[PDB]
């Protein structure tokens, strides 16, 4: 399954 | 003047944290990272002892950058008309922990234990210095591949640590705790411990457990990889739905799963070299 970054700030 | 003290190399990344370039201090060829933050994008401001108005990120970095620690240290900073420029340590060679886990998959528990231990020590250092990071995640952890040392980055969502409730949050939602999702309220240490549970699951399973609000508040941790019973217990304890049910940093580091941690040099020689 798709692993992704998650934006913050 | 910034333009003459540093030679600027390639862009390393950009996002909510600003734009970060590789650099070298011309004084002694020291490797640095050069972070630019636009003034218009700075949410929280703070004051130095001199009274100079600076981004909160500079205040927090100054508080944690004294002495050695598992935090990327602020070496200098400059004000420009429309931006601030931060000069940060640059270990070499380096890979952030998000990319490391993407490439390696779920980490052996011995390696996850060593990484997690160092993150705990770094977060303890921040809290001892009066600083709450508020965005602990694999993306914000750099691995010094030759020394086996982990370094926290990107304090741009952080705050001064306090004992009263926080009602603002600009960190990463999938690492944020259910009391934030439900009530827009959290306390600093117990929210940090929740994010550390997310991080530890991420290490030992190869990705974070929750992607949706309903999963964050649901309180059910399904393990998608083989994980030892002791490690599962620590993760589930960090991910307790009620904040007061979560462990303190002391209880985490005294947990049976955390015992007999490798040294950083051993970690590098066994797992990184
Ligand atoms: O504070 C930082 N934020 C970054 C965001 C994106 C990409 C790189 C970043 N590097 C930083 C610091 C230090 C580094 C040392 C070695 C490599 S980066």
Domain locations in chain B as residue ranges: 1-92, 93-273
B135 counts as catalytic? yes
Q: What angle do CA B39, B41, B42 make, to 5 degrees?
A: 70
| CATH superfamily of domain region B1-92 | Phosphorylase Kinase; domain 1 (3.30.200.20)
Specify whether the CB–CB gap between B57 and B112 falls below 8 A: no
Specify whether the CB–CB gap between B45 and B32 falls below 8 A: no
Strands (E), chain B: 6-15, 18-25, 30-38, 45-47, 53-55, 74-79, 83-89, 94-96, 131-132, 141-144, 149-152, 159-160
Using the atom order of ligand 1, give the atom closest to the CA of residue B90. Answer: 15
Specify whether the CB–CB gap between B143 and B272 falls below 8 A: yes
* Distance from the B157 Cα atom to the nearest Cα atom in chain A, whole angstroms: 6
Rg (CA), chain B: 19
Neighbours of B61 (CB within 10 A): 25
User: Is the Cα dihedral B139, B101, B251, B216 positive or negative?
Assistant: positive
If you take atom 4 of ligand 1, which residue's CA is the nearest one? Answer: B20
Q: How many CA atoms lie within 13 A of B95 on its CB side?
A: 14
Q: What angle do CA B154, B29, B126 make, to 5 degrees?
A: 25
Residue B29 corresponds to which tokens in the numbers above? 């060829």
Residue A6 to residues B84, B138, B221: CA-CA distances in angstroms? 25, 10, 20
Neighbours of B1 (CB within 10 A): 6
- Which residues lie across from B42 on neighbouring strands? none
- Rounded-to-integer distance, Cα B45 and Cα B157, Å: 12
Q: Chain A: residue nearest B202 by CA?
A: A3
Same fold, B1-92 and B93-273: no
Q: Tokens 């640095």 label which residue?
A: B32
Residue spans of alpha helices (H) in B136-187? 178-183
- What phi and psi values does residue B112 have, to the nearest 5 degrees? -60, -40
Give contacts of A8 with chain B, Cβ < 8 Å: 16, 135, 137, 157, 170-173
- Among the four given CATH numbers 1.10.510.10, 3.40.47.10, 1.10.1200.10, 1.10.3430.10, the one describing domain B93-273: 1.10.510.10
């Amino acid at each position: 399954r798709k692993r992704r970054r998650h934006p913050s700030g | 003047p910034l333009e003459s003290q540093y030679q600027v190399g390639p862009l390393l990344g950009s996002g909510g944290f600003g734009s970060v370039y590789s650099g070298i201090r011309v004084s002694d060829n020291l490797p640095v990272a050069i972070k630019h933050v636009e003034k218009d994008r700075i949410s929280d401001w703070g004051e130095l002892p001199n009274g100079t108005r600076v981004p909160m990120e500079v205040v927090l970095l100054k508080k944690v950058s004294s002495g050695f620690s598992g935090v990327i240290r602020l070496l200098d900073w400059f004000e420009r008309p429309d931006s601030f420029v931060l000069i940060l340590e640059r270990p070499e060679p380096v890979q952030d922990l998000f990319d490391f886990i993407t490439e390696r998959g779920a980490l052996q528990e011995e390696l996850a234990r060593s990484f997690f231990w160092q993150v705990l020590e770094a977060v303890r250092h921040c809290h001892n210095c009066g600083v709450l990071h508020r965005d602990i995640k694999d993306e914000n952890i750099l691995i010094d591949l030759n020394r086996g040392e982990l370094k926290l980055i990107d304090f741009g969502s952080g705050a001064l640590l306090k004992d009263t409730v926080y009602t603002d949050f600009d960190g990463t939602r999938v690492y944020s705790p259910p009391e934030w999702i439900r009530y827009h309220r959290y306390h600093g240490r117990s929210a940090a411990v929740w994010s550390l549970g997310i991080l530890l699951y991420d290490m030992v399973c190869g990705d974070i457990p929750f992607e949706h609000d309903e999963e964050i508040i649901g309180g059910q941790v399904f393990f998608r990889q083989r994980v030892s019973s002791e490690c599962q217990h620590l993760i589930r304890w960090c991910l307790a739905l009620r904040p007061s049910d979560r462990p303190t940093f002391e209880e985490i580091q005294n947990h049976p799963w955390m015992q007999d941690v490798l040294l950083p040099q051993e970690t590098a020689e066994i797992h990184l070299h």
